[PDB]
Each structure stands twice: as structure tokens, then as C-alpha cells.
Structure 1
């Protein structure tokens, strides 16, 4: 109750912050409230973990180099049923809760969809009350902070832990050695890894509260420490190198960069996690190891934690002294692999020299794994020499590299894609060789998003509305949102829905106006593309359509033009050149567009800085139009798309990733789908893509290109954007021009629907009403049932 939360608050401000109202900072207040809310989950946290130890359910271990968590405070209140009481307590003390909430750093330990998938899943597994753990790296620096200076992305260290983090508790008793380098002896007592350099792994536990149940699971992130025995001053300074491992998240989205530190990160998180799991299994009730796969599941979050396979084997054979065949039966039965990667350059392949010098034993074990593997292939295909090098874990040509996917495929009992279409290509095409051998191993699990964070928290208006119509069951069972179909003809419900959208718009319009000094037309269409910047996602194409909108105003200023506020956001990897260019182009266009007095309030372009979990929560609920426009074949699933759908936006995009499943659910009539489908893409590769042909064929495209290339957007470097021009014309893998017309045409349909409130909101409601599939609660049921084989409990 209120009075008690108020007494807790003051107690913390007093004792934990050593402050009285008189000189208390806003941060002092945030902290005091966090501690008050965190205190309210301790009992359930102990009891949950206690129950796991007493009843030994099969535990699920989600293993990942990335947990894109965002802020905890508000998410935690909501899931404890505490938000309203806290709101009121804080209000009564003359403070503003939204103000305190603003203080919190994001836990930006993620790049995008892969890392955010991890986050939604933990929330989901806690809500369904599974025995689940999150395991990854406690990066000192998460994804970097993005400033824009002269329309250019600028990186600033995400110093997220400067002031401390009250959502983590260290665990001094569970520190582990992790080993690197050294050499292998195959003595007559077992094979032994010796003369290694040691890093210590200190774990931190973070509470994963379930939505209104009694479960609080754990996320355990590891930290790098130097040992005490593995110039005096320099020696002590040198301890920096060991602790460097957990220092900074690699900021690459969908790109492999074969850096040594990264390899160290990957073993580091694998090694400590695997010990902790064995330790726990051994400390429990339960070749006592025969029960291990009845008590352990390890989901590989892409190939990043791939070493987990040769590591488990290493532990089983060398320490546990199990015979290799047994060790391998159990490895296969413990692991499952989730494939998210699509393009050649994202594929992790590690050079053999590197894997040999850093981890000799793992190399040996990997070769051994490979031998057993290629043996079986020879046996079923003796005249087939090419199938051998094709399915080998070693890409034997030149450099020589380990194909971590191949390793995950052979060490796991289940392999999965993240959307129907994708798993499909994965199974029938990309892995034809392996799936032929065991069709049943390969499955789909279409992606999902938590409707806690992504409806309840980021959008309480909608949540309340929906709840006032159909009650609150939908939160824990999003399929219940179909009940809304029975409100389609409800003229008054449509108004309340539009009102909700408009408040989100008004609020967010404040944000834009107070952060960018740019006049927002409150009633224009909020047309939003937020994701990481990559040529495949095609921010560029959107950008082109912006230019077309602008020109259309210029040629004919009196002509009926539906006002849009066009928002583009997301971070470019610091080494991704073309991505940085694509940013500079957008900010350039905005400068022209936002100041051309002849357009004024008809068109406003914002490039949205420092896009991240807590910003997604702001902008998404405020959106009318969700840009989702990758080249078909290039987007494994996507999740933003889903979050827009649930929050009352209409989606414009290609038949790619889960967009396809969105269209099935709500019916294509109710999305703005356009463009080449995968076939249309292949057929164009077959015949051959000539970018030129479209530039001559479409006069509006011709102008846009000409404007960009001749400095209309860059009079001080008329040829600033040349690199974009070349790529567009000669090296564009993603066929930007081939989809232009279809896109623009499709854009004009959105425009016309927008001029009919009733039709538009009717489509909105048919979307929201069908968004239920996309709850990460459904996804997890599916993983639980056909992969982990654990049951929900409560």
C-alpha cells in the first residue's frame, strides 16, 4: 500500500543514499524508489530458486552474447502489480515518477533483434513460470551512445555502470577460472590442458520477474577479473588485459568481424556458464550424468556461443572421464541451435590458427567431431567427394576456417529459424545437405515480443482500453485479442482508439519539439522506420521516397498532399562505411526539407538519435505507419514489425520475414504489402540486375538520383554522396531501384487510406486484433514443447 511504499522510499533515501529532501538529487530519488521496488521481489526471488533446487524441474539455460534489456524500474513495477501504488506514493511526496524513471541507463547489452529476442524470451519464460536462466556477458560498455554532429553519427562510450546498478547482485562464491592459450598433453590419465593463462569470471544475478505470478528467475551475466598468480606498477596495470574481455559489446549488426577479443568473449561466457550448469546439476538431487539432458537445456543464441559444444565435450571427457560416445550422445541431447543469420558476411567462421593458439584442446575436439561426422557421410555417400568438403566443419581452402553453424548443426538435436519463410529456406535450401540426413532436426519457431514491455509499459492507454473491453486475460494470452473483432462495427470504440493514438502522438510530438527544434504538425502521419542501419533494411529506399515527396511538393505546391512526419532512426556499426553515408544523406535531406518555406508543415523529416530499448518504447506507441522494407530473403523474421502491429500502427513492407505471418494473421487486404517476393528477386539475379535501366525508366527516380549526385543536398561537397551513387548503380546487392515504383505506388495508397479515419482505424483494429500470434509467450510455449521439453508450471 501507499503509506508503506512512502515509508520505504524515505528509509532508502535516508539510509541508502544518506540524503534528506533538502539536498536529494533526482538520481537520489531514482535510486531510493528502485531499492523500494527491488525489495518487493526478494522473497519470491529466493523462493523461486529455492523451489527449483527442492523440486528439480528440468532447467532451461538461454545462452547468449547479448541481452538487450532496456530499463528495469518500470518493467519491474508493472510485473509486480506495483506501478499504480508507486505512482501515487511518489506523487504524494511531491515528485514526478516519469522524471525519476528517466534517470535510469538502458542495459544496452545488445545490438538489435537478436539481443532483444533474448530479453522478451526471459520475460516470457518467467511469466509461464519455467525454470529458466539467462546467461551472457556483463559488458562494461553496452552498445555505444550515438550523438549526431554535423549530420554524422558519432560514437560515445555507453558508460552505463558509472553511477552503479541496483538491478544486479554479485555472487562472490560462484567465481570460476576460465583458461586460454597453453598446450595439450595426452597423458595416460586423460588428456590435460596446461600452462594456460587464467581469467576469473565473477557472476551478477539480475531478477527476471514474471508477470503477476510468484516467479522471479535469474539473469546471470559474467564479469572478467585478473587472478592472483595465473616492474611492479606496470604488472598491476597490466591486469587490464584480462579484464578487457568483458569490457565492451561488439557493435556489429549482422556482420562477422573475426577479431581475437571476440573469440575470447565467446569462450569466456561459454566456459563459466558450462561450469555453473554442471556445478548446479551436481549439487542437486541428481554417469550420474545420464540424467543431464533430462535436467538441462542449452539454447545457442546463434553461433556466438558455439564453443559451448566442444566445451561440454571437453568437460565430459577430460574431467568427468566419460567415454567419448556417451559424452557425445549427451551433448547432442543437451544443445539446441537457433539460426538468425542470413547473409554471407554475418556467418561466423573462425580461422584455424587463431582457434589453435587460443584453445588447442577445443580444436582437437572439433576435429574429432568433424572426423566422426565426415566418416558417416562417406558411409552413406562413398562416390560423393563434393558432399564431403561441403558438409565439413573445416572450410579447407586457403585460410582454413571453422564453420560454426556446421558445428552447431551436428552438436544439437534441434535447429530452428525464426519465421516460417526463413526456417523454410534454412531447411530446404541453405542446409539441404544436413536436413536431408535428419529432416526432423530442423524446425521453425516464429519470433515473438513480450506484451508486457511492448503493450502494458510503453503504451498504458491502449492496454487500459483493450482491458476495459475484454478484460485483462490478453496480457498472458495474447490470442485473446481476437475478441476485439467483435468490435469492428463499434463507431465509439474506434474514436477511443484514435484518441489513444493521438495522445501518444501529442506526447511524442513534445519530445521531438523539445529535443529537436523543429515544428511538429501534430496531425500529420507518423511514418516511422526504426531499426539498425544496414543496406539490406534499406533505409535508403525510404530516404528516396522522402525526396520524391519533397519534389512533388515543389513542382505543384497547391496539389493535395497528405502531411507526414517521417522518422528514421537506428545505429550504424562504426566500421560500416556505407551505413554512415546513408545516415549523412538522411540528415542532409531533413535539413533541406525542414527549412524549405514552400513545404513548411506538410513534410518534416527527423533522424532519431540514440535509438534503443527505452526510445523504441516512446516512438512506437506514437506511430501510424511502420516502414518494414528489407529486400525479400534478407530479413530472417524481424520483431520491430510485431511491436508496431500491436501498438496500433499499419505496416508497409515486403513479403519477407515475419511480415508474411503478419499478413496471414490479419489478411493481406489489411497490410500495405508491395515489392518483389523471393522469386521475383531470384528471377532478377538470373536475368541480371541492371540498376541503370530503372533510373532511365522512371522520371521521378531520375530527379532524386540527380539531386543527390549533383549536390542538391550537399552544396559544399557536391559529390559527397558519390559512394552511395556507385553502390546504387553497380554494387547494390539489395536492389533499391527495382522496388522503387512499387514502393512509391504503395506509399500513395497509405496516403489515401489516411484521409479516411473510419477506414484507417478499422484496419488498425483488424491488425491489433490479429497480433496475438506474436506474443513471445506463444514462442516460448513452442520452444518448451518441441525442443526443451519442459512444461509451463505456475
Structure 2
């Protein structure tokens, strides 16, 4: 692992692996040569790590998720293996730019946003904590679509990230497994039998998950679907079975009850459980299963894992229901990341019956023994029963997957105090009252490797020089930065790092779009999925408000960046995008405003891009309506990277305030109980429209066509929603939000005070390391021990 050997290895791969020489080698060839050179360093530890788990048999943790928002692997692997500087040097000496090589790698965007990214950070933390952890998901041929902007609107493009091949995956053919669909049930004397099913093969692909500087390399196993004139059609028709793992459903906090999606859910669940059972057996027999296996259900998407495990225990392993049921509960733990009713997974019974007849039976059975227990405890409370039932039958009966996850798991957790409380005491009150100890909180976290050492080497280096490198593995150590609260030199060094990041990102912005970026402008950014509850619409109102101010009285200059993908079928989100692009068009071109204000819709927001924009932001927008963001994680990334936060008391924003002190965050707007009171009284949007002149103008402008002269009624739908159907009370926080924004500008005029607040935020980031999050999961849910 010295420069000379890394270089010879690079040349060896370019030659034998890419079949190229320096004469005709492409940039892609160089990236691959480097990827392979780095990859070779993972094998030894990967083999030894998995060997170790088999020998020592520690309890294994299986993170079952439909999403793994991994991003790029090259740099992350180099850093965790402590190879980055040596590789950087090797590539430099070969006359190549390692950064250009790194940009060649496609993001493994097998996730939509927060949920999927949390799984990625967890895999990193679990490997860094030396846990015998495994990630189980689907190897979508197409991840979250690539987003482009045409005439101001979002346009989707298929993300075939595997086009040129993925060097970071290793197919494991010997572990292929069959998954069954449809067919019918038969209750023979030899047990229940699911027959006449269609079979789809599940081919596993393993991706190494290197812990940070610790010799352990865990595994992320993703399953790919494979089929088991007229002849030609039959061959072509193999595409149907393979379509199961073809595309990631692009919905963020929205349930789409498509049959193909249900197929994916069962697919990953069936293959995973079988693979887990097989491994357990390769280690009466299943009495130790729960002590050797923990399966975390990442949201209800893999809820079917409960009846599937039961199906395996009962129909296959011939275990009695009672025993199987206890083993099941001991095995599963469920994490709730949802709050919005539209995000709730509720599969119509008819669909499940046709696709998974045996599972429906097992679910009715579970529900039966579940309700019999309630009736026994509350003989008279009838509403209780249909309220706690796994089946809701109000015209088109459907299965409440969350309820199934609650009864089939020994632990249920929310992802932030405020959220876990709501989940426990409100959403699933009937359940928590019966099983208090079942519900928990596990406040989310982000990995400080990818989200600091990787994306912000400048900040990482500065911090390291002041307090050592212990913080990488123990982020709580960041509090030591408090000793520099008075250190003017340090405060200057901190701001410089931010400046460099902003300068670097500004070049990016300029090369990508025709807009001159004011390098000294405050970087105000809101990057996250486009959704009404996240309210980038409110941000847009504020942008317009600032525009009207400059026009009226021609101020802290700022570059307002808003980015995020909208689900293809999410109409309002797409309108909001067009709204933002429209507004940006007028503001960026109005000569009167000039360099005072610039607006950018950051296109194709994704993990690798987040790694670029976050380190360069000054003001982080986390303005969801109180009670809507279960937790949020971008908020944590911004905090860790030197940005101040403007947001509501929602999700983890609350805990960020607790950690750094509420005065060091720009909190504003209604709080959960405030929103409750307004719903009580009834929300009348027109009220604020009338009482708020700056607001009225903004609205009139967008509704009049000021931002769409060639098509004056373009934003009609947004207006109507905002006035008669805004479930997220956008106008209700407008004033508080705008006032808060001005305060931010005020502080920004004072570099010493601004960076002093930044330091307090960075120094209080510790809690938000996913390492801390995983330790809690390990200790209070999986009953597992680091290393």
C-alpha cells in the first residue's frame, strides 16, 4: 500500500483488466483501473471478516430495506481503508487527475432520499462498529431517475447506472434462490402447500462495506430478478419476471399500490429470509434463531417478511404456530419513518390474495389471534378491535402493513424524539398502551466519513489539527471545538474552509449554468426531495419577497439554491419546480437586482451532488411543517459542515436545537401543538393573504402571470392549493419565516458572530453521527455488541 505498488497495480489493471494502454485508454478506463486497484485492498479483509463471523458466530444484524442510497464507492473506500493520500499520489505521478477519475463513477442511487440514505449511513456505521451486519435490498437495474430541466420543468431520464458495469459488486451465483408468486393454497395432510406458483429466480450480488479504519468489511447483498414466433415471444417474455428488480419506485413519502411494487417487496423479502435461514442452518434447531438473527424492517416496505418467516417456519420447517410466532417477534424490529397518511402502506386484500394467497391466510391468522387478545382484554371496547386490526374494511378491504409490523416485531422505533413520541402516544396509542416497552426512539444519524471526511476534507483537516482524529470514530468529541470559541484565528480558518468550498462549488455552478455567482454571497440552500410538506414553496415565496424588496429599494447578497427531485406522478411538486425555475429566470435576469440575488434550481440532486453543495452552504433550509419530517438527515449534514440552520421545530431539528442551544439555530414558525390549534380552529389561508402585504404581492404576481407572462394562468393549481387545500399551512409560517430570514441576514453581516454560531453548531454535531445511532440500535434492539 505504497505509491510505487499502487501505480504498478494500476498499470496492471489498465492492461489486463481494461485491455488498454496509455495511448488509447479512456478516462473511464482510468477510473476502472483505479477502482480495481482499490478494490483489491478490500478482498483480504472481506474474506477474513465473513470468515470471522462464521467462526465466532456473533449475532447477525440484517438490515432489510427496499432502498440503499449508496452514492459513489471509490473515494469512500479509499478513505475507510486509509488509501486516499497514497492513491492520490499514485494517480498524480501517473499524470492523471484523481478528481476527474472520481467523477466518472455513477451514483448507486438505489434510494429516493432520506430513508434510503439512512440505510447507507447505517451500513457504514455498522461496519465501522465491527457489527456482524448485512444489508439486504434489491439491485435495481435503474435507480432514482436522473433529473433534467427542460423549459423550466422536470424531465426524467432512466438512470442505468450499470451501463458500463459495476466494479463494486460481485455476483454470487451459487446463492441464487427461487421466489414464488401467485398460485394457490392447498391444506394437505402433509401440511399447507402453496402450489401452481410462478417462479422468479433471485441472484444475489454482494458489495463490500468497509468500516472506517478497522479491518472489517461487511456485505450489502442486493437481489436481481432472473427468469427460471411463439418460441421467440417466450424468450422475450422472460423480461416480465426480470422486470421485478428493474426500477426503483421513485416515490418519497407516498404510497403507490402498484402490483409490481408489491412483487418487489415480496421478492426481496423471500430471497432474504431464505438466505438468512440457509445461513443460520449452515452455522428445536430454530430455538436459537432469535439469538443469532435480528432483522430490521426499514419502514413497512418489507413488512411481508413477518408472514414469510412464519410461512417458512410453519409450512416448511413444520414448527407449531405458537413457537414460530414467538421466534418471529423476537427476530423482527420495525422502524417507522412515516407520518403522512398518503405515505401509509395499505395493500388491498384482493391484490395480496391473488399474488400471495398463503401470506394473506397467514396475515388473517395473525390478525385473528391478535384481535382475540384484545377482545379478551377489552371485552366491551369494539371500536378498539377495528382500530387495531391489520385489516381495514371500509369499501375495498386493505392490509395496514404498519400494524402487521407492530405485532410481528419486538421493537418499534421512530427516528427522532418528537416523531417517536407521536408514533407511540398518538398513531399507535392502542398498541403502545398494551406494550409500553415495545416502542422506542432511535434518533437518526449520518456517517461522518462520507458526510465530513469525504465531502469536506478541508473542514475535516482543520478540525483534526485542532482536536485530533478521535472524532471520526467518536463524533461527540467535536465538543472539544468549544475551546476555540474565542480563538479569532480559528474562526478565520473555519470561514476560509467554507469560502474555499463555496468557491469550488461556484465554479461547478457556473460551468453547469449561465449565471455569475457572487462568491461573497450567502449560500442559502434547500436540497431535498420536492414535496409540499417540505415546503420549498415557502422558500420560493421568500425568494420572491426578497426580489420585490430589491426592486422597490434598490442588503446581504445571497445565492438561493433549491434542488430536489419530484416523483414523476407528483403534479404539485412538478408545478413547484416550474415555479422555482420561473422565479429564478426573472430574478437572475433582472438587471436591477444584478449580483444582489441569484437563484439556482440545483438539477439532479443526489448523493454525489449533496457531497458538493452541502460543504459550500451557509444557511440550511429545514422548513417542513411541524410534525411532518419524521426526522430529516440533510439537516444533520449541513450542521456538520459549517452551515447555520433556519427551520421549524420538527423532526431532528428539535434535537439539533437541544444540542447546540436553540439560540444558535434560526428556529421559527408554528410548533406541533400550534399546528393542532390551527387545524382545530380551521385553517383559512386567505387570512394571511389579506393581512400580509408582502405576501399578497407575491401571490398576486405568481397568480397574475408576472413569473409566466407567456402563460399567465400557469400556476393556477398552486394558487388554488395554497388557498383552499394547503395541508401544510404555507401562509401560516410565511411571516415568522420571513422575519427569521431577515435575522439570518443580520447575523451574516457580522462574520465573527456568524462563524461563532457555526462553531457551536459543528461542536454540537456529535450526537448526529450514525455511529451513535447504531450503538443504540445494537444495545436496545438487536442486542448486539460493537466488534
Fold conserved between structures, TM > 0.5: yes
- 1:112 and 1:607 mapped to 2: Cα distance? 17
Q: Secondary structure at the match of 1:336?
A: strand
Aligned to 1:103, the other structure's residue is in SS state coil
Q: Report the alpha carbon displacement of residue 487 of structure 1 after superposing the two structures with TM.
A: 0.8
| Structure 1 residue 412 displacement after superposition | 0.2
Alignment partners' CA distance in 1, 2:600 and 2:518: 12
Distance 1:323 1:738 in 2: 56
C-alpha distance in 1, partners of 2:668/2:592?
31
Q: Kindly indicate whether residue 462 of structure 2 is the aligned counterpart of residue 461 of structure 1.
A: no
Q: Deviations over 1:284-315 (max 9, x none)?
A: 1xx21100000000000000000000000000
Instruction: For residues 606-658 of structure 1, give each alpha carbon's deviation from its aligned partner in whole angstroms, at most 9, with x where no partner exists.
Output: 00000000000000000000000000011100000000000000000000000
Matched residues in 2 for 1:709 and 1:669: separation?
Answer: 37
Q: Does 1:520 align with 2:514?
A: no
- Work out which of the residue numbers 352, 357, 360 in structure 2 matches 1:360: 357
Aligned equivalents of 1:172 and 1:583: distance in 2?
Answer: 43
Tell me the distance in 2 between the aligned counterparts of 1:733 and 1:61. 37
The CA deviation at 1:163 is: 0.4
Runs of 4+ in 1 over 2 A off after TM superposition: none
1:739 to partner: Cα distance: 0.3
Which residue in 1 is equivalent to 2:419?
422
How far the C-alpha of 1:484 sits from its partner, in A, is 0.7
- Distance in 2 separating the partners of 1:516 and 1:767: 32
Deviations 1:143-191 (A, max 9, x none): 0000100000000000100100000000110000100011111111111
Q: CA deviation at 1:268?
A: 0.2
State which of 298, 303, 311 in structure 1 corresponds to 2:295.
Answer: 298
Per-residue displacement from partner, 1:389-417 (whole Å, max 9, x unpaired)?
Answer: 11000102210000000000000000000
Q: Give the match's secondary structure for 1:293.
A: helix
Query: In 2, distance between residues paired with 1:583 and 1:236?
Result: 42
How big is the shift at 1:747?
0.3
TM-score for both structures, normalised by structure 1: 0.99
Q: Does the residue aligned with 1:565 lie in a helix, a strand or coil?
A: strand
CA distance in structure 2 between the aligned counterparts of 1:685 and 1:488, rounded to whole angstroms:
43
Q: What corresponds to 2:267 in structure 1?
A: 268
Q: Does 1:433 align with 2:430?
A: yes
**Partner residue of 2:749?**
755
Structure 2 SS opposite 1:77 = helix
1:718 and 2:742 aligned: no
Deviation at 1:574, TM superposition (A): 0.3
Match of 2:784 in 1: 790
Q: C-alpha distance in 2, partners of 1:732/1:278?
A: 48
Q: Tell me how far 1:488 sits from its aligned partner.
A: 0.5
SS of match in other structure, 2:18: coil
Residues matched between the structures, number: 785
Q: Aligned partners of 2:254 and 2:505: how far apart in 1?
A: 33
1: distance between equivalents of 2:632 and 2:252?
A: 13
SS at match of 1:41: helix
The offset of 1:88, in angstroms, is 0.4
SS in 2 for 1:142: coil
Distance 1:61 1:346 in 2: 24
Residue 688 of structure 1 deviates from its aligned partner by 1.0
Q: How far has the Cα of 1:542 moved from its partner?
A: 0.2
Deviations 1:118-163 (A, max 9, x none): 0000000000000000000000000000010000000000010010
CA offsets, 1:13-43, max 9 Å, x none?
Answer: 0000110000100000000000000001100
> How many Å apart are 1:517 and its aligned residue?
1.0
Offset from partner CA, 1:363-385 (integer Å, 9 cap, x none): 11000000000000000111111
Alpha-carbon separation, structure 1, partners of 2:486 and 2:650: 31
* Partner-residue secondary structure (3-state), 1:201: strand
Q: For structure 1, which runs of at least 5 residues remain unmatched after alignment?
A: none
Distance 1:742 1:318 in 2: 59
Distance 2:696 2:325 in 1: 60
Q: In structure 2, what is the Cα distance between the partners aligned to 1:260 and 1:466?
A: 50
Name the CA distance, whole Å, in 1 between partners of 2:341 and 2:754.
40
In structure 2, C-alpha distance between the alignment counterparts of 1:281 and 1:603, rounded to whole Å: 60
Give 1:746 deviation, angstroms: 0.3
- SS of residue in 1 equivalent to 2:245: coil
Q: Deviations over 1:301-335 (max 9, x none)?
A: 00000000000000000110100000001000000
**For the residues of structure 1 that align with 2:467 and 2:593, how far apart are their CA atoms?**
44
SS in 1 for 2:443: coil
Partner of 1:572: 566
Q: Name the counterpart of 1:186.
A: 187
The whole-number CA distance in structure 1 between the counterparts of 2:506 and 2:183 is 58
* Alignment partner, residue 237 of structure 1: 236
Measure the CA separation in 1 of the matches of 2:553 and 2:213: 56
> How big is the shift at 1:765?
0.3
State the TM-score, normalized to the length of structure 2. Answer: 1.00
Q: Deviations over 1:522-544 (max 9, x none)?
A: 00000000000000000000000
SS of corresponding position for 1:291: helix
Once the two structures are TM-superposed, the CA of residue 601 in structure 1 deviates from its matched residue by 0.3
Aligned counterparts of 1:136 and 1:25: Cα–Cα separation in 2: 33
Cα distance in structure 2, aligned partners of 1:397 and 1:508: 53
Partner Cα separation in structure 1 for residue 36 and residue 116 of structure 2: 26
| Cα deviation code 1:571-595 (max 9, x no counterpart) | 0000000000000000000100000
Identify the residue that residue 669 of structure 1 maps to in structure 2. Answer: 663
CA distance in 2, matches of 1:298, 1:109: 20
Output the CA distance in 2 between the equivalents of 1:693 and 1:359.
Answer: 51
User: Shift in Å at residue 6 of structure 1?
Assistant: 0.3
Q: CA offsets, 1:214-262, max 9 Å, x none?
A: 10000000000001xxx10111011010000000000001000100000
- Name the CA distance, whole Å, in 2 between partners of 1:551 and 1:353: 54
Alignment deviations for residues 671-711 of structure 1 (CA, whole Å, 9 cap, x no partner): 00000001110111111110001011011101100000000
Deviation at 1:436, TM superposition (A): 0.4
